[model samples]
Target: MENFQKVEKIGEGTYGVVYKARNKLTGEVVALKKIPSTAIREISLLKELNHPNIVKLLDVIHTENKLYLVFEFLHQDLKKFMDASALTGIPLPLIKSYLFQLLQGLAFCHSHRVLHRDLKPQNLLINTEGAIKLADFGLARAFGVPVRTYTHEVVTLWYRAPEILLGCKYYSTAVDIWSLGCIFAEMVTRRALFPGDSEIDQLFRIFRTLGTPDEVVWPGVTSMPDYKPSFPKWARQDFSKVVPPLDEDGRSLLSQMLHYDPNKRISAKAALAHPFFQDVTKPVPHLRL
Candidate 1:
């Protein structure tokens, strides 16, 4: 660890500044996260996770009031990828692949009962070899058998799920699925699908696109603490129009993933097998890297 040389400052993260570093011993590049020494929780959490889709934690070094976490090197993140002019108007097939990979990473995390509460494009890393990895686990939590209520302030507002917005105390992997759905749409359009200026506006945008849920669409939704809005019944809009890039199969799959009722939302494993992916000309393969 001591032999590593910091090459350049990469970027700022939620809890720390990241740098590109090289290990003199192995001559390998790595991302070094310089965190506050007080962030013991993050150090412990990163040490415990072992998954290919997750950024690999190499080592931890303590220096005075600061701590450094070394992770496998990644060239860029989804946000940067999206911002690249070359990636403008990304084709549907590529979008599908990225979406599938995102869910695969999420599935692995959920299987271990970990909630990546903050899942934005910026948190998704893409290496030079075309491998996708989830980074920035500052808000991630390891859920237990007896599901606990968590703070509603987690994911970015645009990616936040309806259940969480409704103040549902107990949530599950479905929350991640909703965010994935939003990300999928964002990837397709190269813009935020549901851009809301505020929390109330965010809910309104979602309801307008997907339709306000009733007892049939979302049973028990009315009972949530933050559920106060009373909308006059309106017919649901055609998903095709809302997500113009998606075909019937894709829309169907998106609908299932974005379902307001958490119980009805498709699981990550099931979503991979959904027709949108299955019917694609080039199916997403299990990424080996």
Candidate 2:
């Protein structure tokens, strides 16, 4: 609209472009995402979501073929922040705070019967005071109480749940939890836990770490339509050597969150209560700038 001015082109994705813009009328800086028809679900879900840790959608402008979404501008994303803090590693308390906020946002979404199918560091917005707000709901949608079948082709390969990778049509909030678990480990180590190139390689990377799951560890793994019995069987690697930088509590929590079976994976609410964030259960308003 004529009321806002595009400040700069900040980003581009499969959908469309993102711009840093300012409202000439109110002088408030915001992010503008101009996408195709994919934004309808995001608009409705964001409009209904009210949480401190989720990005706020300020306005929606419908143009000829593209939908313009206005969101409050955030200073940093976890991907960049993690890279900037790579050498020294993010402060423990701050890491705890960020992960806590991530889970808080996710728990709220799940409580509302919504699933944030894609959750990566790039989608997590961070503020100067270390506030973490979950962003980018392009691949997200609401789930049904009756439990409907969802496509496994959601979340990014690295952060995807094992059940989803196996093409399980019926999924739940567990998909998002698996993503958050991967992200939690990245926040600690500042490196992608499983950087697989292809889908089979993706499953291989996971299997290599936790060992190929059998009926005992994860029942019904072979029942999925996409299940491949030919994938190599790998012995489970020690968690300490795999994630050497993480503390005891962090390691335990990460392992639980990354369970091979979605049913055994830690829930977002339960993750918030984990001992890894005992001191950060409540928002630390005084977090580092």
Candidate 3:
């Protein structure tokens, strides 16, 4: 940790505290993540992922009791930007650009079979050049052949998918899509779409908006371990009421990502190609780096 001068504590992360620091040798600004010595999975994943949209991991320093991860410093994150009055209720065109960039980043991660189980506005960094990059992959995992069951206790409750809330163990990248859908809604309305007080309430809010999921819309949903709801029989409701502010195209795309069935959720690549962006002037392109 002494290799870089600690400037200030930026914020608390999923597993550690982040700091803005200056490298002693190069004098470049960097974000330092102080990971506890016990967080082996976070260290292992950060060392392996290398993508332009994903935050760049500059270096790693090991101490007797802690690990420090160095990353390129970014100006701000989506959460801060949204809260800043100067950028509040951002223009639709700008939102589209940011969304496109987010999708590109997610596409790359999904291509590598890595699932960013915890995606939220705070986890997206925005640079001075108006580039949006995905960060904080502490909860991410690279799944390979022989997919196995995992603990259901993942993802922030609001952004979690229905299957996960129902305790489905075997899941995939669709979890991220569900979070993306919530993010998209938040971007459009400038407020969180689903803010439930508890896991059950969160699922209830989702069902109330999108309607109850059945075998027809989401096959195998009934067999999930925690699928329990005694509400009246319901069908999918028109999305206009849920995402009232979004235009038709935007709502269409949101629906695809928010689908209850993980298998039916749209891929990030497909989201970029969706018609919602057809009229966006000069849409953002993925960075080649």
Candidate 4:
């Protein structure tokens, strides 16, 4: 704490307050997250995670009941970037590039058996090169062998997967895929794909857009803890109509990622290989500013 000059509070969430700070010796800026001892275990797990599109954990400082995480700071987040370009809309080629890198990073995390339970534009930091780096792991878990139930309160309501909304606790990495799908659509249009005010409203938003699911479409959906028989049914909307700017291949990949059944949802590895990015040049081996 004495070595770094705390500049200003950058973010605050369930984890704790994050401050943008500068190293006194080097004058380099960083994001400092002040968290509780409860997240001490995740500190070790995050220390081992290193990827270009994942925010780098520069250092860790422990004191009393609090732990401070020093992370490489980026000037902008995906949400701010999108808001700035909301009027003109993000170029299709740029969107493709961003999505490609996002999936690449996610694939690496998934292969390591880590699940980013919370995924949203605000958590995705962007550099001047347009590189996307996944950040904020307060709710993430390294579930290589999960025989126990996970909390369904991990993701934000708008980006939550269908199974989670239905009270399915034993989820997999498929939850992150669903959030990616929502982000994909949001990139095309500067508005959230499913902006619901409540949990039930969120489900209805999904149902109205993708049609209500049943045992036939998603076997055992009817038996989900939160499933209700009186819920109004709706037909799925055409993806082309929903997002007119996205080409055929983009829509195809989006549909696969947003599939009702977690088992049927596309994985991050598979999404990287989707035709939507076939023409897009792969990101360089090592990204630099």
Candidate 5:
């Protein structure tokens, strides 16, 4: 603790309280996450991930009952950027830059067989130079051979995938793509694309936009443990009505991410190659550590 000086509280979440601090010897700013227990997997998993757009864990300190994880300091988060823009929406170029870097980071995770489980605006940290970095791996895990059991109580409600909401135990990387879809749409309108109060409502909202799920659209739909028979059916919505001011490429990419079927959803690598992000790279710096 003597090596670093506490600057101020940066943020707090279910995992723990995060503080901005400075290195006493180097004068470098950093963020410290104070964990209450060693029963967490975040530390172990994060220690293995290395990417330009993913936040780096520089050091770890243990004192008394507290476990501290130190990371490079970021200026702010995507949420604050959107809030400052209000309902006016962020510039299309900037939005595309952020989304592209997000996918770059996500692609690295997927390539490593890790599932981010949570991918929302607040979890994306921003540098003053406008570089985007994925942070808060508290809800993330590496999923490869010897597939481990994961809880359905992961992603935040608005960004939660229908598969997760439906209580599907066999989950995969598509869950993160679904969240990227929601966040992408919100960046366009500067408001949540789907704001549902409960699981049923959330499912209903998703169906209203993407059309009701049936065996035809989503094979093996009835196989899930929580699949219901009386779930009301709805028709597909027009993109013009759902995402205003979006170009054809933007519309197409969003649809790919928001696919009702997990297997049908776009992968992070595919998203990074989408036409929507082809030219949004001029203003943004490379996502490097």
Candidate 6:
């Protein structure tokens, strides 16, 4: 079908290019993600996922060699959107709005046993209306009834959970929540919360701010595959110092998401009920079909 015309190149991943496209008949704008024939798992999982906060898979067009996935076109990703406000950072109410929508989507995915292992600002697509849609399911996995061992090389280094960094393979939805905590702080500070050059560097970055984890803080942490007794010890810093603009309630919620113990980490469902969102009026057009 030649109905979809490519407008411009928007992104490129390890698989292929993503283009901003136009539907010739409907004149509707959409994103065309071109991937190889082998990338069918992403398609199957995405087809099973449907929610306003999750990117909608409109159509699947296949040529003899390549496959094109049509998705609802959003203005930009959360990263670029935040960068545009580089001077002052995202406004409070808007951050609350975006977080609420993101949690809604994540909760929906977790309830279905799907883990978005690579959650970051770049994967969070946003429209001009401030609606957030979780995109880029390339690293997402559909888990089983009991958690299974998985590769630690999942989330981007900056947003990777401490447990994963310490070589914990039996992880779960809590990993994504850790990424959410970093994202929430980035939204408040207009900067990456823990930007590290390498996996070890990333672990230390988190430790420096949140304090090094011990058996008391995270039971069995020392038993992780990568845990070393020689690791540096750093004291924790107050969230207010890192994200000065955030209120007490906001700081409280952030801490829960960044908890050392994955079991103690806040769930997407619980995060929504946090006091930080108490005053959030919840923008208009509540639900999107």
The candidate that wins on lDDT is: 4
TM-score comparison, 2 vs 6, better candidate: 2
Best by TM-score: 4
- What TM-score would each prediction reach against the true structure? 0.82, 0.88, 0.86, 0.90, 0.88, 0.87
Give a tens-digit lDDT track for model 6, residues 135-166.
86533442211122122233357888998888
Which residue runs does candidate 4 get wrong by more than 4 Å? Answer: 36-38, 142-155, 282-289
What TM-score does model 3 achieve against the real structure?
Answer: 0.86
Measured over all alpha carbons after superposition, the RMSD of each candidate to the real structure, in angstroms, is 5.5, 5.0, 5.6, 4.9, 5.0, 5.3
lDDT of each: 0.74, 0.77, 0.77, 0.82, 0.80, 0.81
**How does model 4 fare in lDDT?**
0.82
Instruction: For candidate 1, give the lDDT.
Output: 0.74
User: Stretches of candidate 3 above 4 Å error?
Assistant: 36-45, 85-88, 142-155, 229-235, 281-289
Angstrom error at residue 277, model 5: 2.5
Question: Per-residue lDDT of 174-256 in model 1, one digit per residue for the tens?
Answer: 88888778877777777887877677888888888888887888998888889875754556788778788668888898889
TM-score of 1: 0.82
Q: After superposition, how far is residue 233 of candidate 3 from its true place, in Å?
A: 4.2
Residue range 1-289, candidate 2, lDDT tens digits = 6788999987663345778999998999999877534446556656767788988888778867557778888877777778877888777777788888888898998898778777778788877665889876534442211111122223356887878778898788988888888887777777888887777888899999999988988998988888878878899998898777778998898888888888998999999888888777333333243
Candidate 3 lDDT tens digits, 101-184: 778888988887878787888889877666888887544442221112132333357787888789887788888888888988
Candidates 4 and 6 compared: the better one by TM-score is 4
Candidate 2: lDDT over CA atoms? Answer: 0.77
Worst 10 residues of 4 by lDDT: 143-152
lDDT of 5: 0.80
